[PDB]
Amino acid sequence: SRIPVVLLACGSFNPITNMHLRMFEVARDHLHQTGMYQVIQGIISPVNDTYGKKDLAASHHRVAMARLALQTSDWIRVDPWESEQAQWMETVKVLRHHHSKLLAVPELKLLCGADVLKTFQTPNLWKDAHIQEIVEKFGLVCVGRVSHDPKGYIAESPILRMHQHNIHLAKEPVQNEISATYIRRALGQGQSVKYLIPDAVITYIKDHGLYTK
Amino acid sequence: SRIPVVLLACGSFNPITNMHLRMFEVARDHLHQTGMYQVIQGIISPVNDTYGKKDLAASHHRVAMARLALQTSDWIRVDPWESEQAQWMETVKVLRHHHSKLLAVPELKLLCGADVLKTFQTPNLWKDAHIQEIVEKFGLVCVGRVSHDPKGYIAESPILRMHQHNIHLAKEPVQNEISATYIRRALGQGQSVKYLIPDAVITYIKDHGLYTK
Amino acid sequence: RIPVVLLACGSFNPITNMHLRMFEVARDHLHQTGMYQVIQGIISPVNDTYGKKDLAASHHRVAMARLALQTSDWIRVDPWESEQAQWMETVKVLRHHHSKLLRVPELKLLCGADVLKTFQTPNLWKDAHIQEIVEKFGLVCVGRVSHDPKGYIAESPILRMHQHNIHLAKEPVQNEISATYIRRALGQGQSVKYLIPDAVITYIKDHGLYT
Amino acid sequence: RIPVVLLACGSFNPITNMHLRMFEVARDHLHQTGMYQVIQGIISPVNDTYGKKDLAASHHRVAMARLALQTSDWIRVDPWESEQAQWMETVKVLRHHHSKLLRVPELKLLCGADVLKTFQTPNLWKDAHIQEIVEKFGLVCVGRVSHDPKGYIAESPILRMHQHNIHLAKEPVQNEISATYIRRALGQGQSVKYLIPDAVITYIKDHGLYT
């Protein structure tokens, strides 16, 4: 039979969008169609508030919006652990934590866009030891993005290439037109974002006056 | 103050998608931002069952799915009149009907993608008298589509060019990746289409065994 | 390995890098299957009596196509269709070229996925013609943004019956240029360099086209 | 009307039609504003000590850029940056070229909207450099699918303060080719004709690059 799998998505989810959710569904259908995996759960892990140099709605609101957005999902849930930590954590550490939480144990894989795969190649960005542990001890399910050639990223990277069997490229459209950056700008100008992000998230944004300019 | 406007969308809505709904929101924000219109309502008019040579779920189901999809909309509604007619009707006739239904009367405009605008140029497809009445007596709100140059379509067509003030080009992204054709194929192969079309439409499709291969 | 000739119809008003890329993608796709060897490409501009509107004179479009193809060692423009008295249905251009091949390789129509969607347009194509195209000849489809070729095929009672003769070539590069935008840009005095061949841009300027 | 020189940095491994189109769009955009006259374009390939991996030798990338630009009467490749001992930050290449201009026009960095998004990447750019780029020089941004330049600008405390020196040029044509795909395709023996210049394809073949 099949290897049980849990999908983990890291990011700011500022706010979570229809596209971020779409990614899980495409990743799950892809892993199932290989006939050797059974995705048993998805986890949305919003980044903690100390991260980056770009403003984010408070983690409290980002976790709430993800929870509201996931109410109609019977397999994806938001986990606030990462955002509740005192400080920002490297991706590999969130994976270790959730892996330990699962501990004939399911394989925990990082769900991301092909653009994340390109960042591995950025100098001073990732510790090679981290890139390796991620693709070797956990795995990557990358969903395509216009302008990116995941296959080329994999072939040109010695580490990815050696562990490419742990990198699953999901080939199926995934709403690459909506960026959360656009969603925030539209909200700031009083424009509608309905049908781009869940109705329940729009309601929370309105009720709590988020994303105002 | 402003000219009241009703937006009418024709098409098969087989099934209605997040993108079809997105189109109304983008069209409404665009007309409002010109400062001279106030959109008071949107109407989804599914094509009747005698149309075309491509299979469509029965009009009964297409109207039901649109109604379920529009439950969280406070300004767009599905109107079954067109689909309840004995036979297929030309676009201009559906516009005349809904216009008469509104009868200092709001301006009724056809909402469509820029690809419809290209079809006007197709020989033996549209009666010039229809193209003219549509852009002159009613109006068009076109939402962009990749691969199309609406401005060029307008300039190269003598009729559109003469009445171009009645053709509003909404410039704002609109989920041009999802075609209802793709949605149907995915459903037929047992793949997920969640976050591409409304949850309520997916539920109806499942409950009534629609789009099976 | 079966010899294949690819035929592309359209207005080529003007021919663009996308029209050109279309042949290359289609050819690599057919070769990848292993059962075909593409020996020639043919660009056949539509004649002037056609419907549309601002169509540049056929000899101009044929000349631009020839210039765009100077660096191609396997694709050529064939003026026959543009030189006929009046517009002709696609099937008829395919029969003409089939007759020339015999005076043998398989002649296939090359087009974008958008063309497949037009097959459904009521009163636009005769079913008999669609059937002849995929049954007597063949169809090689190059992907285009927003189109789902596989669904077009599955939903057409005619197309799904001839899947062996319909080849879907995926276009991993979103190189979607529309000639309409090319013409409008030229009209506004803007650059289209690197969107269409340099020789075509020079020809256009020399002959005061699309102003 | 202020004279403007556009400077594009990157690996150009190899230069593609998109990199080229980028200059044309940026130039028409700047001229459209009416307050600028673009007098020169400069392609500055990154030197070999750079991070990445499978970078073709700099003289090869500079040679391909030169070949791609033979038909350009306003854009040129400048090997200075690729000839330095080691990699250099972007600001430093801008200072060097500013110094050459003086020995005056405004020197602006030309890049895609994706570059603007990298400004947010923690520990990737120094704020001082981002500030100098948009305050001392300028930034001309060409649109890219999936990117929202206006939001990048509004959300950056540094960028939103220098909006007069940041020019967003819209790319109405989704001509999005990635050099990574170009290299992979060449590696598999597939065609990239009409995606990059013919002379660059010939150069690549002659020198056994990207095999």
XYZ file of N, CA, C and O in Angstrom, chain B residues 73-171:
396
model
N -23.196 36.498 -2.272
C -23.103 37.753 -3.006
C -24.319 38.567 -2.633
O -25.434 38.048 -2.604
N -24.132 39.844 -2.363
C -25.295 40.640 -2.045
C -25.734 41.499 -3.244
O -26.580 42.365 -3.097
N -25.178 41.260 -4.431
C -25.599 42.073 -5.580
C -25.723 41.328 -6.921
O -26.259 41.870 -7.890
N -25.254 40.087 -6.975
C -25.320 39.282 -8.201
C -26.323 38.144 -8.014
O -26.305 37.469 -6.990
N -27.172 37.925 -9.012
C -28.159 36.866 -8.949
C -28.242 36.141 -10.275
O -27.904 36.692 -11.317
N -28.714 34.901 -10.244
C -28.842 34.155 -11.456
C -30.267 34.399 -11.955
O -31.194 34.478 -11.157
N -30.442 34.559 -13.258
C -31.801 34.724 -13.786
C -31.975 33.618 -14.820
O -31.280 33.589 -15.833
N -32.907 32.681 -14.567
C -33.167 31.545 -15.462
C -33.985 31.818 -16.727
O -34.145 30.914 -17.552
N -34.487 33.039 -16.889
C -35.327 33.355 -18.048
C -34.791 32.859 -19.372
O -35.485 32.168 -20.109
N -33.549 33.201 -19.682
C -32.979 32.775 -20.942
C -32.973 31.255 -21.126
O -33.293 30.745 -22.213
N -32.605 30.534 -20.070
C -32.517 29.079 -20.150
C -33.883 28.379 -20.148
O -33.977 27.210 -20.485
N -34.919 29.094 -19.740
C -36.268 28.550 -19.698
C -36.987 28.740 -21.038
O -38.100 28.233 -21.221
N -36.368 29.469 -21.965
C -37.000 29.693 -23.261
C -36.955 28.421 -24.073
O -36.046 27.607 -23.906
N -37.932 28.263 -24.963
C -38.012 27.078 -25.809
C -36.731 26.874 -26.595
O -36.236 25.752 -26.703
N -36.178 27.953 -27.135
C -34.944 27.825 -27.905
C -33.870 28.843 -27.545
O -34.128 29.820 -26.834
N -32.667 28.591 -28.059
C -31.514 29.465 -27.862
C -31.832 30.840 -28.426
O -32.479 30.970 -29.461
N -31.324 31.861 -27.761
C -31.585 33.232 -28.148
C -30.309 34.014 -28.389
O -29.317 33.780 -27.703
N -30.326 34.939 -29.351
C -29.138 35.749 -29.600
C -28.929 36.680 -28.425
O -29.873 37.077 -27.751
N -27.678 37.035 -28.199
C -27.329 37.897 -27.087
C -28.144 39.160 -27.045
O -28.670 39.513 -25.997
N -28.255 39.839 -28.187
C -29.004 41.077 -28.217
C -30.437 40.904 -27.716
O -30.988 41.821 -27.109
N -31.036 39.735 -27.933
C -32.410 39.510 -27.474
C -32.508 39.320 -25.962
O -33.508 39.674 -25.357
N -31.473 38.753 -25.345
C -31.499 38.569 -23.899
C -31.354 39.972 -23.308
O -32.021 40.313 -22.342
N -30.488 40.794 -23.899
C -30.305 42.169 -23.410
C -31.624 42.953 -23.500
O -31.997 43.656 -22.555
N -32.321 42.840 -24.634
C -33.611 43.541 -24.816
C -34.597 43.107 -23.744
O -35.307 43.917 -23.147
N -34.631 41.809 -23.490
C -35.548 41.305 -22.489
C -35.234 41.859 -21.106
O -36.111 42.405 -20.419
N -33.990 41.714 -20.672
C -33.665 42.217 -19.352
C -33.801 43.726 -19.294
O -34.129 44.287 -18.256
N -33.559 44.392 -20.412
C -33.717 45.840 -20.427
C -35.204 46.133 -20.169
O -35.545 46.924 -19.290
N -36.085 45.478 -20.926
C -37.520 45.692 -20.751
C -37.932 45.409 -19.326
O -38.841 46.044 -18.799
N -37.261 44.455 -18.698
C -37.600 44.085 -17.333
C -37.266 45.202 -16.358
O -37.884 45.314 -15.301
N -36.285 46.028 -16.713
C -35.881 47.149 -15.868
C -36.815 48.341 -16.060
O -36.888 49.218 -15.209
N -37.516 48.372 -17.188
C -38.431 49.470 -17.492
C -39.739 49.394 -16.693
O -40.040 48.383 -16.047
N -34.579 57.649 -17.197
C -34.284 57.500 -15.770
C -34.198 56.022 -15.411
O -34.411 55.624 -14.256
N -33.893 55.215 -16.423
C -33.763 53.777 -16.248
C -32.277 53.453 -16.275
O -31.505 54.084 -17.007
N -31.851 52.465 -15.477
C -30.431 52.096 -15.453
C -29.935 51.627 -16.830
O -30.710 51.141 -17.642
N -28.643 51.786 -17.081
C -28.064 51.323 -18.324
C -27.649 49.840 -18.164
O -26.902 49.493 -17.250
N -28.155 48.973 -19.035
C -27.849 47.540 -19.003
C -26.631 47.235 -19.870
O -26.640 47.484 -21.078
N -25.574 46.703 -19.268
C -24.378 46.404 -20.042
C -23.970 44.937 -19.991
O -24.136 44.260 -18.962
N -23.430 44.469 -21.111
C -22.978 43.095 -21.227
C -21.567 42.971 -20.667
O -20.659 43.675 -21.098
N -21.391 42.055 -19.719
C -20.082 41.787 -19.122
C -19.490 40.587 -19.860
O -20.157 39.547 -19.999
N -18.259 40.711 -20.348
C -17.626 39.587 -21.024
C -16.106 39.700 -21.021
O -15.557 40.713 -20.608
N -15.430 38.659 -21.492
C -13.981 38.682 -21.562
C -13.567 39.322 -22.890
O -14.364 39.381 -23.818
N -12.335 39.797 -22.988
C -11.850 40.422 -24.216
C -11.878 39.449 -25.399
O -11.855 39.869 -26.554
N -11.927 38.154 -25.113
C -11.996 37.154 -26.175
C -13.322 37.220 -26.955
O -13.376 36.850 -28.131
N -14.390 37.676 -26.298
C -15.690 37.805 -26.948
C -15.574 38.935 -27.958
O -16.132 38.883 -29.050
N -14.830 39.964 -27.572
C -14.615 41.128 -28.410
C -13.903 40.740 -29.718
O -14.093 41.362 -30.769
N -13.056 39.725 -29.641
C -12.354 39.289 -30.823
C -13.345 38.584 -31.755
O -13.261 38.733 -32.963
N -14.303 37.849 -31.185
C -15.252 37.110 -32.004
C -16.105 38.004 -32.891
O -16.569 37.571 -33.939
N -16.320 39.247 -32.491
C -17.110 40.146 -33.317
C -16.562 40.157 -34.741
O -17.320 40.186 -35.707
N -15.234 40.097 -34.848
C -14.524 40.115 -36.123
C -14.674 38.839 -36.950
O -14.297 38.814 -38.116
N -15.219 37.786 -36.356
C -15.404 36.519 -37.065
C -16.567 36.587 -38.049
O -17.705 36.846 -37.662
N -16.296 36.337 -39.340
C -17.337 36.376 -40.377
C -18.416 35.305 -40.223
O -18.119 34.154 -39.908
N -19.669 35.705 -40.438
C -20.832 34.808 -40.355
C -21.204 34.451 -38.921
O -22.047 33.575 -38.677
N -20.576 35.142 -37.976
C -20.815 34.894 -36.566
C -21.794 35.890 -35.953
O -22.743 35.494 -35.270
N -21.565 37.178 -36.187
C -22.434 38.222 -35.647
C -23.056 39.047 -36.748
O -22.415 39.314 -37.756
N -24.302 39.458 -36.554
C -24.946 40.325 -37.531
C -24.444 41.711 -37.131
O -24.483 42.068 -35.948
N -23.943 42.484 -38.093
C -23.447 43.820 -37.788
C -24.496 44.649 -37.068
O -24.161 45.456 -36.200
N -25.761 44.455 -37.436
C -26.847 45.171 -36.791
C -26.866 44.821 -35.295
O -27.235 45.656 -34.475
N -26.481 43.586 -34.946
C -26.442 43.158 -33.535
C -25.250 43.744 -32.801
O -25.362 44.182 -31.661
N -24.106 43.762 -33.461
C -22.913 44.318 -32.848
C -23.184 45.768 -32.502
O -22.887 46.220 -31.384
N -23.785 46.486 -33.445
C -24.090 47.893 -33.242
C -25.093 48.172 -32.129
O -24.869 49.036 -31.301
N -26.207 47.456 -32.117
C -27.193 47.679 -31.071
C -26.569 47.366 -29.718
O -26.791 48.081 -28.750
N -25.778 46.300 -29.649
C -25.141 45.936 -28.387
C -24.219 47.041 -27.847
O -24.370 47.459 -26.694
N -23.266 47.515 -28.652
C -22.376 48.551 -28.148
C -23.042 49.925 -28.060
O -22.633 50.736 -27.241
N -24.071 50.189 -28.863
C -24.717 51.500 -28.802
C -25.879 51.647 -27.812
O -25.919 52.612 -27.053
N -26.832 50.716 -27.842
C -27.987 50.795 -26.956
C -27.767 50.196 -25.575
O -28.535 50.461 -24.660
N -26.737 49.372 -25.420
C -26.482 48.777 -24.112
C -25.082 49.086 -23.556
O -24.956 49.848 -22.599
N -24.046 48.505 -24.141
C -22.689 48.733 -23.671
C -21.951 47.446 -23.324
O -22.572 46.417 -23.091
N -20.623 47.503 -23.315
C -19.798 46.351 -22.991
C -18.775 46.669 -21.910
O -18.132 47.723 -21.931
N -18.643 45.768 -20.945
C -17.611 45.922 -19.937
C -16.800 44.657 -20.172
O -17.272 43.539 -19.898
N -15.614 44.830 -20.748
C -14.732 43.714 -21.047
C -13.642 43.594 -20.025
O -12.998 44.580 -19.691
N -13.442 42.378 -19.536
C -12.375 42.122 -18.568
C -11.228 41.444 -19.346
O -11.453 40.529 -20.122
N -10.007 41.922 -19.162
C -8.881 41.380 -19.899
C -8.657 39.875 -19.835
O -9.061 39.201 -18.883
N -8.010 39.361 -20.877
C -7.681 37.942 -21.008
C -6.329 37.852 -21.689
O -6.079 38.529 -22.673
N -5.456 37.003 -21.170
C -4.126 36.838 -21.753
C -4.243 36.412 -23.198
O -5.079 35.580 -23.535
N -3.397 36.983 -24.047
C -3.433 36.648 -25.454
C -4.337 37.568 -26.262
O -4.404 37.451 -27.494
N -5.039 38.482 -25.588
C -5.952 39.393 -26.283
C -5.583 40.858 -26.134
O -5.115 41.294 -25.078
N -5.816 41.624 -27.187
C -5.511 43.050 -27.174
C -6.801 43.801 -27.512
O -6.991 44.251 -28.637
N -7.702 43.937 -26.523
C -8.997 44.617 -26.635
C -8.884 45.970 -27.321
O -9.714 46.308 -28.150
N -7.873 46.759 -26.958
C -7.707 48.070 -27.580
C -7.528 47.951 -29.088
O -8.080 48.743 -29.838
N -6.749 46.966 -29.526
C -6.550 46.751 -30.951
C -7.843 46.280 -31.613
O -8.142 46.673 -32.740
N -8.599 45.422 -30.928
C -9.875 44.939 -31.467
C -10.790 46.140 -31.704
O -11.412 46.275 -32.757
N -10.870 47.019 -30.711
C -11.701 48.212 -30.835
C -11.262 49.125 -31.993
O -12.086 49.542 -32.801
N -9.973 49.429 -32.086
C -9.494 50.320 -33.148
C -9.677 49.770 -34.558
O -9.939 50.521 -35.474
N -9.546 48.463 -34.731
C -9.677 47.870 -36.058
C -11.112 47.630 -36.496
O -11.369 47.313 -37.655
N -12.057 47.793 -35.581
C -13.450 47.601 -35.939
C -14.174 48.933 -36.028
O -14.326 49.649 -35.032
N -14.613 49.296 -37.234
C -15.326 50.558 -37.411
C -16.505 50.736 -36.463
O -16.702 51.828 -35.938
N -17.279 49.679 -36.215
C -18.432 49.820 -35.327
C -18.029 50.039 -33.870
O -18.596 50.902 -33.183
N -17.050 49.271 -33.401
C -16.594 49.395 -32.013
C -15.941 50.727 -31.800
O -16.175 51.401 -30.783
N -15.116 51.114 -32.769
C -14.404 52.375 -32.695
C -15.345 53.573 -32.613
O -15.095 54.510 -31.858
N -16.434 53.537 -33.370
C -17.386 54.650 -33.357
C -18.140 54.723 -32.034
O -18.552 55.798 -31.606
N -18.323 53.579 -31.382
C -19.043 53.544 -30.117
C -18.165 53.155 -28.946
O -18.658 52.688 -27.920
N -16.870 53.396 -29.080
C -15.928 52.983 -28.058
C -16.152 53.556 -26.678
O -15.677 52.988 -25.701
N -16.887 54.661 -26.584
C -17.169 55.277 -25.288
C -18.123 54.370 -24.483
O -18.248 54.513 -23.258
N -18.789 53.447 -25.171
C -19.701 52.499 -24.513
C -19.020 51.145 -24.259
O -19.690 50.161 -23.928
N -17.709 51.082 -24.477
C -16.959 49.854 -24.246
C -15.956 50.164 -23.147
O -15.002 50.920 -23.359
N -16.176 49.595 -21.967
C -15.296 49.842 -20.824
C -14.306 48.680 -20.608
O -14.691 47.533 -20.341
N -13.029 48.974 -20.755
C -12.009 47.956 -20.581
C -11.547 47.961 -19.131
O -10.929 48.920 -18.659
N -11.882 46.902 -18.408
C -11.483 46.814 -17.004
C -10.074 46.254 -16.959
O -9.834 45.116 -17.369
N -9.148 47.076 -16.476
C -7.751 46.691 -16.351
C -7.452 46.289 -14.906
O -7.217 47.139 -14.048
